[PDB]
Amino acid sequence: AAMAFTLADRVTEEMLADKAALVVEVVEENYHDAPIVGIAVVNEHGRFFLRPETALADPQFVAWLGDETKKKSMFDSKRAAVALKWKGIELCGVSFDLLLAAYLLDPAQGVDDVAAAAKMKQYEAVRPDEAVYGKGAKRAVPDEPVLAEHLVRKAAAIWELERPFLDELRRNEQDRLLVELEQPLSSILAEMEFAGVKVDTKRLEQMGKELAEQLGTVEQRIYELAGQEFNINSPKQLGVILFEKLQLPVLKKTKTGYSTSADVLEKLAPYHEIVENILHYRQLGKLQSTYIEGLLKVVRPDTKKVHTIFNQALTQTGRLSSTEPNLQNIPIRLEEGRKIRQAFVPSESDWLIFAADYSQIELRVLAHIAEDDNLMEAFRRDLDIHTKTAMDIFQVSEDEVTPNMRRQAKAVNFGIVYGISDYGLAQNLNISRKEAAEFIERYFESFPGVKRYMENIVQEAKQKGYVTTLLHRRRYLPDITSRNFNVRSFAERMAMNTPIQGSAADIIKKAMIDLNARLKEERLQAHLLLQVHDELILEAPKEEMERLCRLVPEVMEQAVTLRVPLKVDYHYGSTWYDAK
DNA sequence: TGACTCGATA
DNA sequence: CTAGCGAGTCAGG
Ligand SMILES: OC[C@H]1O[C@@](CO)(O[C@H]2O[C@H](CO)[C@@H](O)[C@H](O)[C@H]2O)[C@@H](O)[C@@H]1O
Ligand SMILES: [Mg+2]
């Protein structure tokens, strides 16, 4: 049965009620400076469809959109907010976002459209967006009749589902998580994405030229050492050269052939000079193809800025993800790739980049949740946690801790946060499972609180069916009861890791909200540009650096109060690279 | 187009 | 051993 609605030719007063489900449709996946193809409004007075040219040009409708007292319920309000920002229109009063609500109720459902969220409550009177717009190559905006009904059905679904979703969130003790954390954060992310980050394209282009030269040199050296030319970028062709032509030992297999991952190559390096060259080629090619070429492809030709899109409803732990471009995995470990960051610069003259990061937030969160006396004392003394761990597990004084010992203790600490595994640790440290098991046993002997925590959280996940974070985010773990060891073990590691990674996510998200409130109170021109899980990157006039040095770390350190202090380090400079 | 294998970040 | 995004090459639909 068709859904009744008014195909309005002009905006009317009954369309501007103080409570409504609103749909401002942007079909392009990347919504930056993208077209708004249609608008739908459902309220106490009925259902309406408005053509964008009409509504967005109407003074009354625009005022309604920006009126904080006129409440709107939507799905992915950030998409609409940003698309409107590019049009110079402000969207206010969004009191309910179905996408974020669905995400909080169950991140594993992968809700990506109204139909998916609705199906959670057995509501199916709305079509999936993919069904209406098509996949990708066959993607397109249908004729007005089809488009209008779809937008109205989505608005109708939002209108009907708000109550049941809010009711379940309340039962889950997630009502404040939606209203006081995720929704306000959505507006902040919208501002960050819209602002974008300025890129020194000339510098990237120069780097591209330098890499192309090096890539060619190493490429030729590889053919020379191999005695023939082949496609180095093909793990298949490479494997033939390495394990057949050059007779290198096969220390590991993938699933469809020879394994050529860096970890494998590093072990084969001593056998042939070609290996070190393959690794070098790998490094350079990664920088060239993924970063230099990737960034240059998405930088806006006019402003020279990149506008990432932070997916706020994707990760299973509560973290954000970044796309087109992903600005959360820009090189930093190796100097060569790190220089890429010199191309990220302030958007205005005489401004600087400011970066603040939490020091060991995950281990501090673990200390808090496990209430481990030894771990809490370590952070209360602000000790080097890896040296501290080495001292305890290897039973030596601080002065006796050697570099190799600290390295292994660090690997142990990573395993503890990830969900410790003798096999996983053994693989990471290139030792036997028995040896890794011994390190783990020593760790739990030194940190009995952590041991108790890991045991208890797994039992809790089994009893309740899910685990939670400090701010009540949840993750269901049905595999925790599997009778398949590998499947169950993965779930157990998730039970151990999610409260840690997730609570750290909760904390920085709250810090972002608190920070923006403080920046506004102080009327600072400084503003957020990026978030990279445990760090915040801003840009601001050089004259604001001294104030930021005190303000940002304090806001981040005070976002939440734990049993151990939170510590934030900071740096600033002329480019992202220099903010070190 | 999409399953794989690779590698970048925290 | 946790969580992401995405480029390259390859083959099964
Ligand atoms: O607008 C981001 C928001 O949209 C979803 C779908 O509801 O993802 C779409 O947009 C992303 C950014 O362009 C794409 O990476 C993704 O492929 C596309 O489906 C949500 O996942 C996200 O929260
Ligand atoms: Mg850090």
XYZ file of C-alpha atoms (C1' of nucleotides) and ligand atoms in Angstrom:
627
model
C 0.000 0.000 0.000
C 1.356 3.400 -1.031
C 2.114 6.018 1.609
C 0.148 9.254 1.371
C 1.997 12.563 1.359
C 1.849 16.049 -0.114
C 4.171 16.894 -2.998
C 4.510 20.564 -2.037
C 5.268 23.274 -4.587
C 5.951 25.786 -1.817
C 6.658 25.856 1.929
C 3.679 26.194 4.274
C 3.438 26.935 8.002
C 2.249 23.453 8.989
C 5.545 22.157 7.585
C 7.386 24.175 10.225
C 6.044 22.592 13.434
C 8.334 22.475 16.486
C 8.721 18.689 16.234
C 9.386 16.781 13.031
C 11.198 13.942 11.319
C 13.417 15.553 8.689
C 15.156 14.100 5.660
C 17.659 16.217 3.708
C 18.842 13.703 1.130
C 22.414 13.619 -0.157
C 22.918 10.553 -2.358
C 26.612 11.035 -3.162
C 28.577 8.922 -0.657
C 31.020 11.790 -0.121
C 28.690 14.608 0.930
C 31.187 17.471 0.779
C 29.812 20.240 -1.464
C 27.360 17.606 -2.710
C 23.827 18.065 -4.085
C 20.754 17.807 -1.881
C 18.297 15.904 -4.082
C 15.163 16.142 -1.977
C 13.603 16.980 1.359
C 10.919 15.204 3.357
C 9.175 16.325 6.520
C 6.809 14.321 8.697
C 5.096 15.896 11.686
C 1.777 16.022 13.540
C 0.206 17.731 10.514
C 1.140 15.154 7.896
C 3.834 14.057 5.453
C 5.478 16.402 2.948
C 8.024 16.309 0.125
C 9.818 19.501 -0.899
C 12.078 20.119 -3.877
C 15.479 21.434 -2.681
C 15.465 24.466 -4.990
C 12.177 25.484 -3.372
C 12.814 24.754 0.301
C 16.426 25.917 0.495
C 15.493 29.210 -1.162
C 12.568 29.806 1.199
C 13.458 32.208 4.054
C 10.935 30.617 6.430
C 12.228 27.090 5.856
C 15.858 28.146 6.258
C 15.015 29.944 9.495
C 13.199 26.819 10.702
C 16.245 24.662 9.930
C 18.430 26.956 12.004
C 16.022 27.354 14.926
C 17.336 25.344 17.879
C 13.841 25.344 19.413
C 12.365 23.520 16.415
C 13.346 19.907 17.087
C 14.212 17.468 14.321
C 14.651 13.702 14.283
C 16.919 12.458 11.502
C 19.184 9.667 10.260
C 22.851 10.687 9.784
C 22.350 14.338 10.655
C 26.069 15.037 10.127
C 25.674 14.312 6.405
C 22.817 16.824 6.173
C 24.575 19.355 8.391
C 27.760 19.329 6.322
C 25.942 19.389 2.977
C 24.047 22.431 4.268
C 27.222 24.099 5.586
C 28.608 24.040 2.040
C 25.450 25.944 1.064
C 25.816 28.470 3.874
C 22.837 27.071 5.779
C 22.892 26.183 9.477
C 21.098 23.117 10.832
C 20.137 23.255 14.508
C 17.775 21.487 16.865
C 18.557 17.886 15.947
C 17.325 16.054 19.045
C 17.446 12.477 17.731
C 19.714 10.772 15.202
C 18.514 7.271 14.320
C 21.891 6.262 12.864
C 23.715 6.991 16.117
C 20.906 5.434 18.162
C 21.103 2.195 16.169
C 24.902 2.203 16.383
C 24.836 2.451 20.171
C 22.237 -0.305 20.520
C 24.342 -2.722 18.446
C 27.416 -1.722 16.416
C 27.599 -5.229 14.930
C 24.370 -4.798 12.955
C 26.228 -2.527 10.546
C 23.276 -0.156 10.196
C 23.999 2.081 7.193
C 20.508 3.206 6.186
C 17.061 3.844 7.613
C 15.741 0.469 6.436
C 18.462 -1.366 8.377
C 17.710 0.516 11.585
C 13.978 0.001 11.114
C 14.366 -3.735 10.595
C 15.734 -3.870 14.162
C 12.220 -3.086 15.422
C 10.404 -5.219 12.826
C 9.469 -2.144 10.770
C 9.839 -2.864 7.056
C 7.697 -0.214 5.340
C 10.767 1.483 3.856
C 13.217 0.365 1.151
C 16.998 0.052 1.546
C 18.790 2.996 -0.094
C 20.765 0.580 -2.280
C 17.502 -0.781 -3.684
C 16.347 2.708 -4.667
C 19.601 4.311 -5.829
C 21.480 1.239 -7.016
C 24.969 -0.098 -6.324
C 27.750 2.076 -7.723
C 28.160 2.116 -11.500
C 24.385 1.751 -11.764
C 23.868 4.298 -8.985
C 21.561 7.236 -9.716
C 18.731 9.403 -8.407
C 15.369 7.979 -9.575
C 12.511 10.056 -10.973
C 10.694 12.395 -8.588
C 7.769 9.994 -7.991
C 10.083 7.210 -6.803
C 12.404 9.592 -4.959
C 9.641 11.428 -3.109
C 7.970 8.277 -1.808
C 11.303 6.921 -0.607
C 12.250 10.069 1.302
C 8.781 10.266 2.842
C 8.911 6.598 3.892
C 12.303 7.217 5.509
C 10.955 10.255 7.352
C 7.903 8.236 8.401
C 10.140 5.462 9.736
C 12.201 7.947 11.751
C 8.997 9.499 13.097
C 7.697 6.102 14.249
C 10.962 4.647 15.560
C 12.258 7.492 17.739
C 10.236 6.420 20.788
C 11.119 2.693 20.728
C 14.811 3.410 20.133
C 14.982 5.988 22.929
C 13.146 3.585 25.234
C 15.648 0.795 24.623
C 18.593 3.159 24.972
C 17.201 4.196 28.355
C 16.905 0.553 29.434
C 20.537 0.063 28.358
C 21.552 3.155 30.365
C 22.697 4.682 27.075
C 20.265 7.612 26.905
C 22.927 10.110 28.006
C 25.496 8.416 25.769
C 23.330 9.371 22.791
C 22.087 12.777 23.924
C 25.082 14.121 25.829
C 27.959 12.489 23.953
C 27.390 11.146 20.438
C 24.889 13.719 19.194
C 26.871 16.754 20.390
C 30.023 15.127 18.977
C 28.328 14.750 15.588
C 28.047 18.538 15.333
C 31.714 18.950 16.256
C 32.816 16.397 13.647
C 30.687 18.243 11.080
C 32.613 21.440 11.848
C 35.958 19.629 11.609
C 35.164 17.972 8.283
C 33.815 21.197 6.788
C 36.874 23.169 7.931
C 39.202 20.646 6.320
C 43.000 20.631 6.470
C 45.155 22.715 4.121
C 47.682 20.782 2.054
C 50.961 22.003 0.566
C 50.377 20.312 -2.792
C 53.649 21.559 -4.276
C 55.524 19.770 -1.502
C 53.640 16.519 -2.095
C 54.265 16.752 -5.832
C 57.980 17.256 -5.185
C 58.009 14.235 -2.871
C 56.257 12.240 -5.572
C 59.031 13.126 -8.001
C 61.744 12.166 -5.508
C 60.047 8.847 -4.753
C 59.563 8.047 -8.440
C 63.323 8.376 -8.913
C 64.153 6.202 -5.902
C 61.502 3.664 -6.887
C 63.149 3.367 -10.291
C 66.632 2.941 -8.832
C 65.619 0.264 -6.325
C 63.456 -1.364 -8.988
C 66.450 -1.828 -11.287
C 68.673 -3.080 -8.472
C 66.029 -5.712 -7.742
C 65.942 -6.967 -11.333
C 69.739 -7.019 -11.290
C 69.858 -9.162 -8.145
C 67.068 -11.382 -9.477
C 68.628 -11.821 -12.903
C 65.385 -10.837 -14.624
C 62.486 -8.387 -14.668
C 59.132 -9.121 -13.020
C 56.199 -7.408 -11.301
C 57.538 -6.730 -7.815
C 54.065 -5.563 -6.744
C 52.768 -9.087 -7.284
C 53.236 -11.281 -4.182
C 52.696 -14.145 -6.619
C 55.449 -13.229 -9.079
C 57.678 -12.178 -6.184
C 57.274 -15.518 -4.432
C 58.413 -17.335 -7.572
C 61.595 -15.266 -7.741
C 62.350 -15.610 -4.035
C 61.411 -19.198 -3.218
C 61.991 -20.837 -6.596
C 64.560 -18.903 -8.636
C 66.636 -17.842 -5.609
C 65.828 -20.856 -3.430
C 65.079 -18.858 -0.290
C 63.579 -20.900 2.573
C 59.796 -21.000 2.903
C 59.189 -20.105 6.546
C 55.495 -19.301 6.144
C 52.538 -19.781 3.799
C 49.533 -17.516 3.216
C 46.586 -19.584 1.995
C 46.942 -19.371 -1.776
C 50.725 -19.483 -2.082
C 53.989 -18.073 -0.731
C 53.915 -15.527 2.094
C 55.950 -12.381 1.430
C 54.876 -10.162 4.325
C 57.497 -7.861 5.850
C 57.829 -10.069 8.941
C 58.744 -13.001 6.696
C 61.118 -10.969 4.526
C 62.947 -9.593 7.565
C 63.842 -13.175 8.485
C 65.033 -13.957 4.947
C 67.166 -10.812 4.653
C 70.397 -12.512 5.783
C 70.142 -15.037 2.929
C 70.066 -12.670 -0.043
C 70.690 -8.989 -0.787
C 67.503 -8.814 -2.860
C 65.319 -9.036 0.247
C 66.396 -5.723 1.800
C 65.715 -4.107 -1.574
C 62.228 -5.625 -1.812
C 61.424 -4.219 1.630
C 62.721 -0.791 0.609
C 60.698 -0.935 -2.610
C 57.644 -1.886 -0.525
C 58.136 1.125 1.755
C 58.537 3.615 -1.105
C 55.694 2.188 -3.172
C 53.353 2.404 -0.200
C 54.188 6.083 0.301
C 53.839 6.861 -3.401
C 50.633 4.983 -4.249
C 48.628 5.245 -1.032
C 49.688 8.599 0.382
C 51.198 10.917 -2.239
C 48.904 9.880 -5.086
C 45.989 9.231 -2.746
C 46.061 12.671 -1.137
C 46.638 14.516 -4.404
C 43.555 12.800 -5.835
C 41.230 14.084 -3.120
C 42.626 17.542 -2.371
C 40.178 20.245 -3.504
C 41.661 22.036 -6.566
C 40.520 25.475 -5.412
C 41.235 25.605 -1.668
C 43.942 22.918 -1.635
C 42.214 21.430 1.407
C 41.276 17.834 2.133
C 37.916 17.210 3.803
C 37.846 13.814 5.463
C 34.632 12.184 6.588
C 34.680 10.720 10.079
C 32.460 7.663 10.228
C 30.947 7.900 13.704
C 28.851 4.745 13.411
C 31.184 2.040 12.179
C 33.779 0.624 14.590
C 32.851 -2.141 17.000
C 34.567 -0.432 19.929
C 33.341 3.145 19.722
C 36.309 4.647 17.909
C 35.834 6.918 14.906
C 37.199 5.934 11.487
C 38.329 8.355 8.747
C 37.908 8.160 4.959
C 38.534 9.989 1.684
C 41.184 10.618 2.825
C 41.884 8.566 5.921
C 43.835 11.061 8.043
C 44.199 8.614 10.929
C 46.919 6.470 9.366
C 49.355 9.023 7.932
C 52.964 7.730 8.305
C 54.981 8.617 11.394
C 57.083 5.635 12.528
C 59.694 5.847 9.758
C 61.263 9.229 8.981
C 60.809 8.832 5.215
C 57.041 8.537 5.450
C 56.811 10.901 8.408
C 57.949 13.745 6.153
C 54.570 13.454 4.420
C 53.212 15.381 7.410
C 55.209 18.438 6.354
C 52.569 18.840 3.636
C 49.775 19.384 6.184
C 49.821 23.066 7.024
C 47.757 25.794 8.768
C 44.809 27.167 6.761
C 45.613 30.817 7.434
C 48.654 33.066 7.501
C 50.562 33.171 10.789
C 48.683 30.193 12.232
C 50.258 27.015 13.614
C 49.374 23.351 14.117
C 48.880 22.233 17.741
C 48.746 18.539 18.707
C 47.915 17.076 22.123
C 48.008 13.363 22.933
C 47.200 11.183 25.935
C 50.172 9.337 27.396
C 49.316 5.615 27.656
C 45.574 6.152 27.992
C 44.711 2.496 27.370
C 46.982 1.159 30.114
C 45.761 3.893 32.469
C 42.171 2.892 31.706
C 43.124 -0.727 32.413
C 44.665 0.289 35.744
C 41.396 2.025 36.618
C 39.018 -0.759 35.588
C 41.083 -3.620 37.012
C 41.956 -1.676 40.163
C 45.376 -3.312 40.104
C 47.412 -1.835 42.965
C 50.779 -2.279 41.239
C 49.637 -0.826 37.915
C 47.839 2.097 39.578
C 50.924 2.906 41.654
C 53.049 2.822 38.506
C 50.966 5.545 36.874
C 50.653 7.518 40.098
C 54.478 7.710 39.949
C 54.236 8.465 36.207
C 56.767 5.698 35.558
C 57.948 4.479 32.164
C 55.372 1.684 32.045
C 57.396 -0.595 29.777
C 60.497 -0.364 31.953
C 58.283 -0.939 34.996
C 56.754 -4.030 33.407
C 60.222 -5.349 32.504
C 61.401 -4.861 36.081
C 58.482 -6.877 37.427
C 58.315 -9.754 34.949
C 62.074 -10.250 34.651
C 62.708 -9.526 38.337
C 65.461 -6.928 37.961
C 66.105 -3.404 39.229
C 65.510 -0.391 36.986
C 69.247 -0.155 36.326
C 69.290 -3.817 35.272
C 66.607 -3.372 32.606
C 68.284 -3.765 29.222
C 66.891 -2.424 25.934
C 65.920 -5.931 24.801
C 64.036 -6.455 28.053
C 62.080 -3.222 27.646
C 61.235 -4.184 24.062
C 59.812 -7.526 25.136
C 57.928 -6.024 28.082
C 56.382 -3.503 25.685
C 55.152 -6.357 23.478
C 53.674 -7.962 26.582
C 51.848 -4.730 27.452
C 50.369 -4.546 23.955
C 49.186 -8.125 24.234
C 47.589 -7.401 27.593
C 45.505 -4.554 26.162
C 44.636 -6.509 22.988
C 43.624 -9.651 24.854
C 46.713 -11.695 25.654
C 47.520 -14.849 23.681
C 50.591 -17.044 24.033
C 50.423 -17.735 20.292
C 49.945 -14.085 19.372
C 52.709 -12.886 21.672
C 55.008 -15.666 20.455
C 54.429 -14.584 16.855
C 55.046 -10.920 17.668
C 58.271 -11.598 19.583
C 59.417 -14.491 17.393
C 59.672 -16.869 20.344
C 58.037 -20.188 21.214
C 54.513 -20.456 22.587
C 55.970 -21.949 25.767
C 58.304 -18.977 26.241
C 55.512 -16.461 25.642
C 53.298 -18.338 28.099
C 56.030 -17.911 30.715
C 56.138 -14.131 30.174
C 52.361 -14.000 30.526
C 52.429 -16.022 33.738
C 55.061 -13.669 35.153
C 52.976 -10.661 34.145
C 49.882 -11.917 35.947
C 51.995 -12.702 39.008
C 53.106 -9.053 39.100
C 49.684 -7.643 38.208
C 47.133 -9.927 39.938
C 44.451 -7.263 39.619
C 44.762 -7.328 35.844
C 44.622 -11.136 35.934
C 41.432 -11.040 37.990
C 39.985 -8.470 35.606
C 40.656 -10.556 32.498
C 39.062 -13.588 34.156
C 36.037 -11.630 35.370
C 35.321 -9.688 32.186
C 35.203 -12.914 30.168
C 32.806 -14.432 32.713
C 30.705 -11.252 32.563
C 30.513 -11.309 28.763
C 29.262 -14.882 28.976
C 26.712 -14.116 31.705
C 25.298 -10.886 30.264
C 26.045 -11.479 26.588
C 27.993 -8.245 26.139
C 30.677 -6.012 27.637
C 30.507 -2.282 28.332
C 32.679 0.819 28.493
C 32.966 3.612 31.052
C 30.192 5.638 29.401
C 27.981 2.586 28.814
C 28.777 1.790 25.199
C 28.211 -1.916 24.576
C 29.358 -4.732 22.336
C 27.587 -8.075 22.131
C 29.814 -11.153 22.010
C 27.713 -14.175 20.987
C 30.868 -16.123 20.049
C 31.949 -16.110 23.700
C 29.978 -19.352 24.106
C 31.244 -21.087 20.961
C 32.577 -24.630 21.296
C 35.198 -23.846 18.660
C 38.394 -22.796 20.425
C 39.566 -20.264 17.833
C 36.175 -18.586 17.514
C 35.673 -18.454 21.277
C 39.202 -17.179 21.926
C 38.741 -14.259 19.541
C 35.558 -13.310 21.421
C 37.401 -13.558 24.744
C 40.077 -11.167 23.489
C 37.310 -8.770 22.417
C 35.809 -8.989 25.901
C 39.183 -8.005 27.323
C 40.027 -5.319 24.756
C 36.722 -3.566 24.078
C 36.261 -2.029 27.541
C 39.790 -0.633 27.258
C 39.803 0.664 23.672
C 36.148 1.685 23.999
C 36.514 3.570 27.268
C 39.525 5.401 25.836
C 37.266 6.367 22.912
C 34.559 7.571 25.311
C 37.089 9.732 27.130
C 38.533 11.541 24.122
C 35.041 12.072 22.680
C 33.993 13.772 25.915
C 37.237 15.761 25.847
C 36.358 17.077 22.378
C 32.969 18.290 23.558
C 34.454 19.897 26.682
C 37.233 21.463 24.605
C 34.906 23.114 22.123
C 32.837 24.543 24.952
C 35.995 26.051 26.479
C 37.245 27.434 23.165
C 33.911 29.196 22.716
C 33.854 30.637 26.249
C 37.338 32.058 25.658
C 36.391 33.136 22.126
C 39.597 31.635 20.768
C 39.955 31.317 17.005
C 41.635 27.934 17.525
C 39.624 25.002 16.238
C 39.813 21.237 15.947
C 40.967 19.714 12.671
C 41.470 16.035 13.463
C 41.207 13.310 16.085
C 43.465 10.262 15.892
C 42.112 7.973 18.627
C 44.188 9.326 21.522
C 45.196 12.697 20.115
C 43.589 15.950 19.035
C 45.025 18.192 16.327
C 44.048 21.860 16.083
C 45.201 24.930 14.203
C 45.217 28.447 15.633
C 46.821 31.893 15.395
C 50.402 31.855 16.640
C 49.247 34.330 19.302
C 47.040 31.635 20.855
C 49.710 28.959 21.387
C 50.553 29.865 24.969
C 46.894 29.723 25.990
C 46.371 26.417 24.178
C 49.402 24.874 25.886
C 47.566 25.239 29.183
C 43.955 24.873 28.069
C 43.993 21.791 25.828
C 45.956 19.415 28.086
C 43.854 20.422 31.108
C 40.542 19.838 29.329
C 41.738 16.462 28.052
C 43.144 15.411 31.429
C 39.944 16.403 33.245
C 37.397 14.929 30.801
C 36.825 12.067 33.233
C 38.127 11.242 36.686
C 39.807 7.861 37.040
C 41.603 6.117 39.903
C 44.857 7.166 38.225
C 45.747 10.524 36.675
C 45.411 11.140 32.956
C 48.459 12.760 31.348
C 48.527 14.738 28.112
C 51.599 15.810 26.153
C 51.557 18.515 23.492
C 53.575 20.079 20.687
C 53.067 22.731 18.037
C 54.773 23.958 14.895
C 54.454 25.318 11.366
C 53.299 21.960 9.947
C 51.817 18.743 11.303
C 55.325 17.264 11.028
C 56.753 19.947 13.308
C 54.028 19.510 15.914
C 56.380 17.059 17.630
C 33.558 -6.267 -9.469
C 35.461 -8.640 -5.287
C 38.316 -12.127 -2.578
C 43.260 -11.845 -1.074
C 47.505 -10.106 0.621
C 49.784 -6.447 1.792
C 50.826 -2.361 5.117
C 49.732 2.303 7.320
C 47.924 4.305 12.079
C 46.571 4.070 17.337
C 47.445 -10.520 20.379
C 42.829 -4.958 19.332
C 40.540 -1.426 15.856
C 40.506 0.977 11.294
C 41.194 2.291 5.420
C 42.592 1.087 1.137
C 46.128 0.007 -2.841
C 47.842 -3.670 -5.711
C 47.016 -7.974 -8.377
C 44.495 -11.838 -9.297
C 40.839 -14.979 -10.579
C 36.022 -17.055 -10.039
C 31.400 -15.200 -11.022
O 27.821 9.888 6.049
C 28.616 8.917 6.722
C 27.710 7.772 7.220
O 27.098 7.145 6.069
C 27.328 5.720 6.058
C 25.996 5.082 5.564
O 24.868 5.450 6.368
O 28.418 5.494 5.095
C 28.402 6.083 3.744
O 29.333 7.230 3.679
C 30.756 6.979 3.997
C 31.496 8.323 3.833
O 31.390 8.809 2.495
C 31.325 5.821 3.094
O 32.626 5.401 3.520
C 30.385 4.575 3.125
O 30.819 3.633 2.154
C 28.849 5.037 2.679
O 28.003 3.889 2.711
C 27.705 5.373 7.517
O 28.548 4.222 7.656
C 28.398 6.640 8.018
O 28.278 6.764 9.431
Mg 50.249 8.870 22.661
